[PDB]
Every structure is written in C-alpha cells, then in structure tokens.
Design a protein around this nucleic acid. Structure first.
Ligand SMILES: Nc1ncnc2c1ncn2[C@@H]1O[C@H](COP(=O)(O)OP(=O)(O)O)[C@@H](O)[C@H]1O
Ligand SMILES: Nc1ncnc2c1ncn2[C@@H]1O[C@H](COP(=O)(O)OP(=O)(O)O)[C@@H](O)[C@H]1O
Ligand SMILES: Nc1ncnc2c1ncn2[C@@H]1O[C@H](COP(=O)(O)OP(=O)(O)O)[C@@H](O)[C@H]1O
Ligand SMILES: [Mg+2]
Ligand SMILES: [Mg+2]
Ligand SMILES: [Mg+2]
Ligand SMILES: [Zn+2]
Lengths: 232, 609, 410
DNA sequence: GCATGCATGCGCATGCATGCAT
DNA sequence: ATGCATGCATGCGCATGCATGC
C-alpha cells in the first residue's frame, strides 16, 4: 500500500510500471483490542510506504522543416516504411498517406465530415499483411492492434454498466475508444460479432458511438483511422 | 470594519437606476413574481468592482452573508411590507469564472472556501426532507408558550409539567442531497469516474433529476470531524450550491417575425423547407416532411377521456450514401429534445422504463427509459432493420398512443411517451432492386408500416447531370473555409449573408434563413393552435375515398404502404402542420392540397421491368 | 396567542346549536354515541362556515389541537344526553363501568373517535407540491393506492397491576416505541417502600386498529419527463378496511414529520373513492360488435364470459378495450410484455410493519370479480398464455415454486 | 423445442468501522 | 469507563427470468 501527498497525486495512472522511492512505516491510530473471529495475532501493526519519489517506465522544428522542404520527401518517406519487406511500393505509399491522414472540417450547419482514411486488404495467406499492421502500430504515435473479436481482456467497442454499490455509470474503454486520432489495425475482419459489426458502421461513418441505457444516453467520440486485413 | 465596508460596497453596487442599471427592475420583477432569489452576473461586478469580486471569489461565506444583508436592506427600503414574509434572501451567481471553472476530476483543496462552477451529470438523488428552524411549545398545565431557535429538544416544563408541540407554529425548510458525476464524453478512456456531493435547500430542491446534465455554482467547504477524543485528520468535502442551471429568448425579434410572416405568407413554408440544410443537396420532399415533424400536429382530448395521437412518424429507405444519417444528425442538433438510439445499441429494457428493487429500503422503483425521457421530443433510430422484433413490439405502444404500461407485483404505473420517431433502414439486398416489388425490398410486416405515417424511398440514380451537380455542391462545400481563420491553420439578420462558396454566384437572387431565427419561428409556430374549417373537411374526405378506390386506378404502379384509417389522420395531421408553418388561425384549401401532394408522392412508386 | 377555553366553549355551543339542517342531527349523534350505538363521528368544516370562519382557518393551521378540543368537548357533552344504560355491553364496557363504580386518562374511558372533513372551498393539492409549507396543516390529496398492509392492534394506553397491591397504573402512549415501567408508583407502595414490580395486562389495555398504505400520483399530473411520486398514509379507527390496492382515492389528512432532518407522513381523516348500446360513440360502425361488449359487462348467472376480437390493423380494436377498461369499476389493462410474468400471478415481498414475507397479487388478482383487457394477445409468452387459459377454464391460479405454494381465486 | 449464457432478485453469513448504554 | 450491537460493504449459495443457438 502506497501513500502520496501534495503534488504526488495523479502522477500515476493505474496499470503503469513504476519505480518508487519512499519510507517504510506503519500506521499509528492509538491502540485497540483485537477483534473478529481470529485473535491469534498479537501486537501486529499494518505497514505501508510513504512515497517520496516516482519514476514511470525548438531545434527539431528546423530539422522537420528541412526534411519536409526537399523535393524528394515522398520517396524518402515511402522507403522509410518497412524497408525489410520486399516490394509493395504502392502499398507503402498508401500506408504513409494513411499515417499522415487528411483534415476534418466543420460546417455552420453543425454537420461534420470525416477527415480520416480507411483501407482494406484482401489476399492469400503468406503475403506479409500482419507485419505491415504491426509496423503501422509501432510507427504511429497512437496505435491499437486487434484481432476482430476484441482481445484477450478487452472488447472492440465500449460498454456501459452501473455499479449497484455506488450507483455510478462505469464505462469500459474499448479498442476503438482507447484510440483518438490514431490508427486501429484489425486482423481477421470476417469473424466480427453482430453487435460490434453494427457499431463499427457508425464508428466509420460518423466517428461517434451512441449508447443508451436505463437513465443514461451518451455519445462517445471515436476519431480512428482503420486499417483492416482479411482472408478469401 | 471590513464587513461594514463590504456591506457598504454591496449596497452601492445595487443602486444603478441613475446609471442605466437593470437590477432595480429585476428586484421589482422578483417582488411581483413572489420570488426571493436574485441572480447577479459576476462579470458585471468585476467590471464595476474588481476588488470586491476577488474577495468574494477567494472568500465566500463572509462576503455572501454581507451581500445577503445588503439585499435584505435594499428590499426593505423598496418595500418593507414584502420583507416581513421571509427572514433572509438568497443569492445566485452567473458569469465566467475562468480559473475557477473546475470539473469534478480537477477539484482540489486549493479551492476551499471559494466559489466554484462545475458541469456534470446527475446520478444519485435523495428524498426531500424538512429541516427545523424554529420550535414552539405549549404547556397545558400552566398555559404558557415557549419559543426556541435553531442554527436539544425540550420536553418538560420547569416544574416537570409535560409540554405539547405545536407543529403548525413551527418553521421548516426543504433539504435534498444530489450527486454529480463527470461526463463520460470528457473523461479519459479506461479510467474510473469521480463524483461530487451537492446540497440543495429552499427553492432549488426540485430543480434536478437523475440522468440529466446540469451546471452548478456553489461554495466548496469541508465537514468537521465528528465528536471523539481521537481524530483521523481527514475531512469530507461537500459542495453547497447557490445556483443550478439546465444546460441548453430575445425581445425585439417579434417585430421581425410579424413583418416576415405578414409579407411572405404563402412562401413561408417553401422558404423554410428550402433553407433546412444547405449542406445537403436535393430531397425537397424529405425536407418538407422533416419541417412538418419539427412543427408537429395538434393533440386532442375529449370528454370521454379518449386520446388521439398528434405525432408523425417517417421511415426513410434507400441506397447507401444518400445523406440519411446526415439528416438524422442535423435533426439531432436542431431539435431541443433529440435522442439517438441505434438498432442494437439499446434493447427493449433501455428504450422502455424498467423496475428495480431498491436494496436500501426494500421498495421497488422505476427507472425511465430512452423514450420516456424524450417526452414531446424526437428519437432517431439509425440501422432500424437491425432491431429485434421484440423491441419493435415494445415501440408499437408508444407509436400508437404514446404511453408505456409497466407492472411488477407491488407496483404498477403508466408513463407518458408522447414522442416522435425518425427511422433509417437499409434494404434487405443491400441495394434497392428496381425490378422487385417494394414489399420484397422493405421486408417488414404490414402493421409496422401502417403505424408509420410516411414512407420515403430514395434512389442513387447515376444520371450525368445529377452527378455533375452533386459533385459541384460537394466540392464547393469542401473548399469552403470559415472567415477569420488563417489559411492552412490546423484544428441576428433574418437572411444569412451571401457566400461565394456556400451559395454560389447564381444563387444571389435568393437567400437562406438563419438558424437562430428559424428556431425561434419554429417555436412560435409550434405554440400556435390552428382550427380546421368545413371547406377542407369534405375535400379531404373525398380525396381519401379516391385514394382508397385508386386500387382500380393504380395502372402499373405499386403501393409502398397499405391505406388504412390512419391515413386520414395522417392527412389531417400534415394539414395541421402546414397550417402551423405560416402563422394563421384556419385551415385553407392549399393547406390540404400540400398534404395530398405529399401523400401522392410518398405512397405510390413505378416498377421497372 | 389566544386562550383555548373560549374556543372550547365556542365548539361546545356549536355542537349544540346547529339545527339548520328539519332535524337536530348532532343531538341524535350524541345520543347514539352515549348509548354505544355509534363509534365514529365526523365533523364538516363546510358546516362550520355558517359560524365564524376564523375557526376554520385555525383548524386548518393547528388541526391536532382542535381535534383534541373537539374530543374533549364531545366527552363532556356525552353525560347530558344519556338516557339509559348499555343494552349489550362488552369486555371494555365492563371495565369502564367497574372503574367508574370504584386520575384515569381521558382516552382510557373514551370509546369514540373524531375526524375532520376538508372544506369544499379547499382545492385538492398534488403529492409533488406538498412540502415544508404544509407541515402541520390540513391537506387533501387525490391519488391511486398501490400497497396496503394488514390490520393489526396497536397500544394506546397501557395498564399495569402491582405485585403487592390492587392499584392499577396507567401509561399513555404517544411514540412508536415506549419504555415499560418497573416499579410501582402507588401511594401504598410509596409509603411502605415495598418495591413491588408491575405486570402488563392485555385485557385492561386499550388497542386500536392500525394500517399502512401507499399512494401514487395520477399519470395526468406528472410533469414532462418525470416519474410519479409516492406518499405514505396511516389508517386508524373505523377508517380501516376502506382502501384497497388499485383504487383511485381522495384522502383528507394532516402532514406531520417524524424525528435536524425529519421524515414526513400523512394521517388520514377521510377517505373517499372516485338503446343503451352506446359504448364509444366516437367510433363509427361496429353496431353488432357493441352488444357483445354490453353482455360481457352484464355477465351471466360458472357464468363468466370471455371474448376475443381478431382483426386487421387500423380498425381501432385498442380504443374499445380502453373504453371497456375505463367503464368497468374493477378493471385492468395490459399492453404486452411490459406486464409479463411477475406482472400477472403474484409475488412474495417484505412487510413494512411485521418485517416478514407476504404475497402481493398481479393484474389478474386485482381484477378479481372484474374485467381484464389484453392487447396484442398473440405476442404474449407461453407461460402467460397458459396462465390465461387456466384462468379462463378453472378460474383459479395455482403457483408452486421455491417459497410459493398457493391457489389464488381469479 | 430446449439447454445455456447473462442479468437480477432473495436470502444469508462474514468482515471492517464506530458510536455510546449500562 | 468499557465492551457490544448495528450500519455498511462483500463473499456465498441459490433460484428465477430473458435471450439464442443448434
Ligand atoms: N514479401 C516479403 N518479404 C519479406 N518477408 C516476407 C514476405 N512475405 C512473407 N514474409 C514472411 O513470411 C511471414 C508471413 O506471415 P504473416 O505476415 O503473419 O502472414 P499473414 O499476415 O498473411 O497471416 C512473415 O513472418 C514474414 O517475415
Ligand atoms: N445529395 C448530397 N449532397 C451532398 N453530399 C452528399 C449527398 N449525398 C451524399 N453526400 C455525402 O456522402 C456521405 C454519405 O454518408 P451517409 O450520410 O452516412 O450515407 P447514408 O446515411 O445513406 O448511409 C455524406 O458524408 C455526405 O457528405
Ligand atoms: N371505425 C372507426 N371510426 C372512427 N375512427 C377510427 C375507426 N377505425 C379506426 N379509426 C381511427 O384509426 C386509429 C386506429 O388506431 P388503433 O386504435 O391503434 O388501431 P388498432 O387498435 O387496430 O391497432 C384510431 O386512432 C381511430 O381514431
Ligand atoms: Mg496474418
Ligand atoms: Mg447512413
Ligand atoms: Mg391497436
Ligand atoms: Zn403496588
């Protein structure tokens, strides 16, 4: 158990791998007689650690301007995309322009138009499709990789529940929700479930997901570029 | 000394009648309306006195007490007669706080004893409870009355004589507690939400309900550790509200509305339908139907308690990429109470209110559904074909009479569901087959179609001229950039200003209506209650008879929906809506002719070989 | 402030000088109350309007005090109108006679209850709008009853007998919970300092019927997008056994809290219930479809009748069912799966008073000796259809599941 | 036509915290 | 002054109802 004070609060999100330096101490709340069913333990005080340090596991502008000002930026970027994979120059260029992406535009009427690109790939097994998806996931600043049916311990789309104890609306971040402005790679496009398949239509079209349950109606934002692979 | 100076400054703030002030008129209105709460803009106070505003923001309780005292003195000076009823008045706050605009996630101890503004959703509410202010007791043995004030309950006299309580002579005030949770649309993904507790007193008790988005301005304070020889050193923080607002009218635009109506008259409906959505090209009949939904019909109740529906329902079917979802989103944006519910997004338990047994008290309570919340509103259903049959059966009752009947042993109720429905669905074959009859393509039961009022079929005909016009419009809209924004940057008049890209050189002869003026006019028209005339009734009846007898005059064309008794009500409702479109009092012939033309267009379609 | 003696005298003279109704009603009522031929008396505030109207406002503001004053005045007036002894006297009357033959609390010797009826000029309120401003006042509420508790006795005055003396000790009860006495406060025991211990007596003690009920708002008065609210009403005296679940009632009562937050409740004073083939004249045609409904409403001499109407959509079958539901005194209307399963038959639920389990019936149970209406019959579940068939053929429902083993009459 | 997956009420016991009647 | 009954989660075991998939 860890105790953080003052400015150390909210520096760590649950799930992070951390190295913490602190003081090993015990709780002090006076004295009290042992209670409960078990009274074998005598003179035992609960212990904790008081946290004191946490570690979580302008010049570049000119460099980027020089890189983009060349006449051969397109070829350099295309070659930079997966040099290990033989061939597929057009596919690499398409992947690069997908990574850069377009621009979204609003209108006075309030309607919005999509600014992200979606791609589909079909082919026989052994054409190195998963490798491209992994390279895109690693290269993109924000990237998610799924198997179509969700993942080991996370679904493809968000879900909403209500905690009976606290009566609060808890939302589980799905694969699409966890990415905002990034790239979502989807292998095995054929094996999608019905509800996820229905939701992905709205996710691709309006980049939003609408969920309505007892006493709640919400519209979450999912501005995700989609890169998909499927088999014959 | 400081409190007296603050009171003097607050008193000086209110006396603005000789300085173009409005607060005196506000106080007069409050006295007229029997209200004892005044809302003061923080921005105006900061403009007039920055030091007082800073002191109030950094120190709330003392400054608020001083301001309440100043308001008491001011109301006394105006009419001491009114001030006798209430002991003290209460203060409301409004404006832009800036750094103190704090979300539930960002609340910290740095804002203690300050005034903060929060925006959130309500999740927990408590029953209204009375709280004692003063107590009066009487002694039958000695015929003596005693008074106590609260800010120990006596039971016996000095000579141990019993005391009897006078409940009527006592003073009680309302009290309630609510919970506010951070909106999921703004909370980081994958993280648990955080909540705040708010206390409501006096007239603010019944201004919030669970599942609603509110904005609350109030003071932030700690609760002292309760009695005990040992303390843990941790205090609970609870917000004390002073103003609650439901997040969502002018004065001189009435003249503009009257002039526009008295001028255009007949052209009002055509202009409103034309300017519904510039971003979408074509589909005039669909826009007219959407405008009719926005206006709506007239609900009628009679002596026997019978109810006649006044809402309209429209179902759109067509090929992909014909701008149906765009229309649904536009209706969602424009309509005041609009709720989107996709096919498999919500089930029958979500669309319809349910019963849950409360573990705290052992009772059974009702939780409202999606359609229950949208009373006198619009519900949009995309991917309507994917919806299960049971959900359609549940929706049937709302579409028929707009009411929901619920009963689980120990409780039974009927809730109002007077709403309107937009539905978007795809053909069974993916794309609309021209040769096959509409019955095979739609693939829906006759009852569901009959309960719908209008059916529209949209086709993506690849005509070169239509394609050229659509491409022109789409690229003109895409090339547009908002004025005042630098090129390459990343991310009220009745008639809208002409734009070279949004409208075009040819469209200079005509103009589109502004959104705000359109909303105001729609609201005013919805207020109006038209009356049907005798001339139109016979015409409508004869045309209904002609429509029913058209079975022998249909030629090679087929009918999209069966013609039943509900079609006559649909005709009358569309006529009433079109009469509402232009501010009038009676139904005319052209009013029924428009609805007849709409029915002619909607109900019959040619079949290609 | 004002002296209560003058107002008590005014009440006494009002109870004796209201001939303007021609027979003296209050004289007869007092005679019946004195001869134990009547156990309840109701006072009309509209009748008081002939006298000074200030009394009406005072009662509307401090109802309990004036109720006690009226009770005391009636008790004092009772001896004057007595003419004869009790013809047939019960156990309590025997105790009263023996005690008089040989201070006693006023309510112990008292054997009548008084109630107030709200003025007709007083407009009925809404359950949502009763708040702290109405605490301690007299209000009128219209609603629908949803839950009713069983009748049980409740103590009023407790009687204790000493271990070493014949003296009887009396203790009034004005709280939901009370502390029993131990030592004997009798003068004999006080002088001798014997320290005898008291014992409770059930025969000498006084009990009154007690009942709980709940009310809900009408669907018409519910605001936009809200849910009907519920209120709790306490029933005592002869008002017991009047209200039943599913009935539309109007109750006149007092708004009182319970112990600086508090919980509120209502104390009831008056509870009230709210060719010929012209069924639904709004619907054209169907001349031969309306006599069948009339015969269904009339019924046979088992003589029950069941009717089913199958039709194409748009011929307005639902409106006829709604009209039948509205016309019948005891009626229930079902739309579909919104009242399936537990909605019909019955379920077991906790009690508010006893703290144990009791059976609450569904729509079919409420519609006993009435008419039930079902819409979209083909869409019902198999279990519901079997239950409906059982009701039609046998008129009783048999339930045998974990914790439930019952046969309900329908 | 039925067994099973997924909520949800029911009844219960068990553990942790605290607040004061004898 | 001190030890205990109670309010508030939480696991346990169970039955019951709604949806669907072969
Ligand atoms: N054109 C290629 N250049 C280099 N390696 C390749 C190429 N095609 C296939 N491979 C190799 O073969 C393997 C293909 O497996 P994988 O990419 O998972 O197939 P798929 O994605 O189609 O299921 C990869 O590990 C990759 O190293
Ligand atoms: N008539 C039209 N005018 C302008 N844009 C159109 C038109 N028809 C289609 N579009 C464009 O094509 C896209 C269609 O997507 P969407 O509205 O989701 O189609 P649907 O609702 O039929 O599934 C929209 O983004 C819209 O900008
Ligand atoms: N014979 C008739 N006379 C008058 N109105 C009718 C008649 N038949 C149908 N209607 C109208 O048509 C509508 C039918 O709706 P509804 O009662 O829900 O039909 P159903 O009960 O068959 O589902 C009603 O609102 C009613 O006003
Ligand atoms: Mg692969
Ligand atoms: Mg669409
Ligand atoms: Mg019907
Ligand atoms: Zn004794």
């Amino acid at each position: 158990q860890l105790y953080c004070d003052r400015y150390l609060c909210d520096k760590v999100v649950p799930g992070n791998r951390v190295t913490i330096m602190g003081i090993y101490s015990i709780k002090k709340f006076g004295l009290t007689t042992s209670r409960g069913r078990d009274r074998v333990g005598v003179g035992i005080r609960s212990s904790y650690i008081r946290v004191l340090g946490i570690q979580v596991d302008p010049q570049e502008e000119e460099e980027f301007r020089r890189l983009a000002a060349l006449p051969n930026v397109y070829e350099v970027i295309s070659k930079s995309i997966a040099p290990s994979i033989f061939g597929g120059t057009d596919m690499k260029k398409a992947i690069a322009c997908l990574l850069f992406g377009g621009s979204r535009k609003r209108l006075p009427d309030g309607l919005t138009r999509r600014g992200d690109i979606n791609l589909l790939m079909l082919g026989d097994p052994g054409t190195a499709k998963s490798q491209l998806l992994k390279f895109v996931e690693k290269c993109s600043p924000i990237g998610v990789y799924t198997s179509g049916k969700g993942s080991s311990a996370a679904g493809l789309t968000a879900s909403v529940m209500r905690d009976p104890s606290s009566r609060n609306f808890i939302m589980e971040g799905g694969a699409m929700v966890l990415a905002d402005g990034g790239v979502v790679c989807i292998d095995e496009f054929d094996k999608m479930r019905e509800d996820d398949r229905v939701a992905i239509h709205e996710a691709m079209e309006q980049q939003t997901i609408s969920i309505a349950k007892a006493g709640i109606t919400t519209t979450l934002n999912s501005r995700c570029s989609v890169l998909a692979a499927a088999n014959s | 000394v400081e409190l007296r100076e603050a009171q003097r400054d607050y008193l000086d703030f209110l006396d603005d009648e000789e300085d173009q002030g409005i607060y005196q008129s506000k106080v007069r209105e409050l006295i007229s309306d029997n209200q004892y709460r005044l809302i003061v803009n923080v921005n105006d106070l900061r403009r007039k006195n920055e030091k007082r505003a800073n002191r109030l923001l950094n120190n709330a309780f003392e400054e608020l007490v001083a301001f309440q005292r100043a308001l008491k003195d001011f109301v006394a000076s105006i009419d001491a007669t009114y001030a006798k009823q209430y002991e003290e008045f209460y203060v409301g706050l409004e404006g832009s706080f800036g750094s103190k605009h704090v979300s539930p996630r960002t609340l910290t101890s740095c804002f203690l004893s300050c005034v903060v503004c929060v925006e959130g959703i309500v999740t927990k509410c408590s029953l209204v409870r009375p709280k004692v202010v003063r107590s009066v007791h009487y002694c039958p043995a000695t015929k003596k009355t005693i008074e106590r004030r609260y800010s120990v309950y006596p039971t016996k006299d000095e000579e141990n004589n019993p005391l009897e309580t006078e409940y009527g002579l006592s003073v009680y005030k309302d009290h309630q507690t609510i919970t506010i949770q951070e909106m999921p649309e703004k909370a980081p993904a994958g993280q648990l939400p955080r909540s705040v507790d708010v206390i409501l007193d006096d007239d603010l008790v019944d201004k919030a309900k669970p599942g609603d988005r509110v904005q609350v301005v109030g003071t932030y304070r700690c609760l002292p550790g309760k009695k005990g020889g040992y303390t843990s050193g941790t205090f609970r923080t609870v917000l004390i509200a002073c103003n609650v607002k439901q997040m969502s009218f002018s004065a001189e635009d009435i003249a503009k509305i009257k002039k526009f109506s008295k001028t255009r008259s007949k052209d009002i409906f055509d202009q409103l339908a034309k300017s519904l959505a510039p971003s979408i090209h074509g589909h005039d009949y669909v826009k007219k139907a959407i405008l009719c939904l926005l206006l709506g019909g007239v609900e009628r109740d009679l002596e026997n308690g019978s109810h006649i529906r006044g809402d309209i329902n429209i179902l759109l079917i067509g090929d992909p990429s014909v701008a149906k979802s765009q229309l649904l989103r536009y209706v969602l944006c424009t309509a005041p109470r609009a709720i989107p519910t996709t096919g498999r997004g919500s089930s029958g338990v979500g669309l319809t209110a349910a019963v849950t047994t409360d573990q705290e008290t052992g009772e059974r309570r009702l939780e409202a559904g999606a359609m229950v919340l949208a009373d006198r509103g619009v519900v949009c259903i995309d991917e309507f074909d994917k919806m299960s049959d049971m959900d359609r059966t549940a929706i049937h009752e709302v579409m028929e009479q707009g009411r929901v009947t619920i009963a689980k042993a120990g409780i039974h109720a009927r809730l109002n569901a007077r709403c309107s429905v937009l539905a978007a669905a795809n053909p069974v074959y993916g794309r609309y087959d021209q040769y096959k009859t509409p019955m095979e393509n739609i693939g829906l039961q006759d009852s569901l179609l009959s309960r719908f009022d209008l059916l529209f079929i949209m086709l993506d005909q690849m005509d070169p001229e239509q394609d050229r016009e659509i491409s022109d419009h789409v690229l003109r809209m895409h090339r547009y950039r908002a004025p005042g924004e630098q090129d390459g940057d990343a991310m009220t008049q009745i008639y809208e200003k002409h734009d070279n890209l949004l409208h075009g050189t040819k469209k200079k002869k005509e103009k589109m209506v502004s959104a705000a003026f359109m909303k105001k006019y729609i609201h005013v028209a919805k207020i109006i209650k038209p009356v049907l005339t005798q001339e139109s009734a016979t015409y409508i009846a004869e045309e209904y008879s002609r429509l029913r007898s058209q079975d022998s005059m249909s030629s090679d064309t087929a009918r999209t929906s069966p013609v039943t008794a509900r079609t006559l009500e649909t005709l009358i409702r569309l006529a009433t809506a079109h009469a509402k479109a232009r501010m009038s009092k009676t139904v005319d012939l052209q009013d029924a002719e428009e609805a007849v033309e709409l029915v002619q267009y909607a109900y019959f379609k040619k079949v290609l070989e | 402030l004002k002296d209560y003696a003058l107002e008590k005298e005014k009440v006494k003279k009002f109870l004796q000088e209201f001939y303007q109704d021609k027979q003296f009603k209050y004289g007869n009522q007092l005679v019946r109350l004195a001869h134990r031929e009547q156990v309840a008396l109701y006072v009309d505030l509209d009748d008081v309007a002939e006298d000074d109207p200030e009394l009406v406002d005072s009662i509307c503001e401090n109802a309990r005090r004036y109720a006690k004053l009226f009770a005391d005045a009636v008790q004092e007036l009772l001896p004057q109108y007595k003419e004869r002894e009790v013809v047939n006297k019960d156990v309590l009357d025997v105790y009263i006679e023996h005690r008089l033959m040989m201070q006693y609390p006023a309510e112990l010797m008292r054997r009548f209850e008084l109630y107030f009826q709200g003025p007709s000029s007083n407009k009925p309120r809404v359950i949502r709008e009763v708040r702290a401003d109405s605490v301690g006042k007299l209000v009128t509420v219209r609603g629908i009853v949803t839950r009713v508790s069983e009748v049980k006795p409740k103590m009023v005055v407790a009687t204790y007998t000493c271990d070493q003396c014949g003296a009887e000790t009396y203790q009034p009860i004005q709280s939901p919970t009370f502390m029993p006495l131990i030592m004997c406060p009798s003068q004999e025991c006080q002088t001798n300092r014997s320290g005898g211990r008291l014992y409770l007596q059930t025969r000498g003690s006084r009990f009154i019927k007690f009942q709980e009920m709940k009310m809900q708002e009408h669907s018409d008065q519910v605001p936009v997008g809200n849910i009907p609210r519920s209120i709790t009403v306490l029933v005592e005296g002869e008002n017991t056994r009047i209200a039943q679940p599913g009935d539309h009632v109007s109750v006149t009562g007092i708004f009182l809290p319970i112990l600086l937050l508090s919980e509120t409740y209502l104390e009831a004073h008056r509870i009230v219930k709210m060719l010929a083939a012209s069924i639904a004249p709004e619907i054209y045609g169907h001349e031969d479809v309306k006599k069948a409904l009339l015969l269904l409403l009339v019924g046979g001499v088992r003589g029950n009748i069941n009717i089913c109407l199958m039709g194409d959509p748009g011929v307005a079958k639902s409106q006829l069912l709604s009209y039948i539901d509205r016309l019948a005194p005891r009626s229930q209307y079902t739309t579909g799966r919104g009242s399936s399963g537990v909605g019909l038959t019955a379920a077991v639920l906790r009690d508010s008073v006893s703290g144990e389990l009791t059976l609450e019936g569904g729509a079919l149970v409420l519609a006993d000796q009435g008419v039930c209406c079902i819409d979209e019959f083909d869409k019902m579940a198999e279990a519901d259809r079997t239950a409906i068939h059982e009701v039609m053929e046998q008129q009783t429902i048999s339930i045998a599941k974990a914790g439930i083993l019952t046969t309900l009459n329908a």
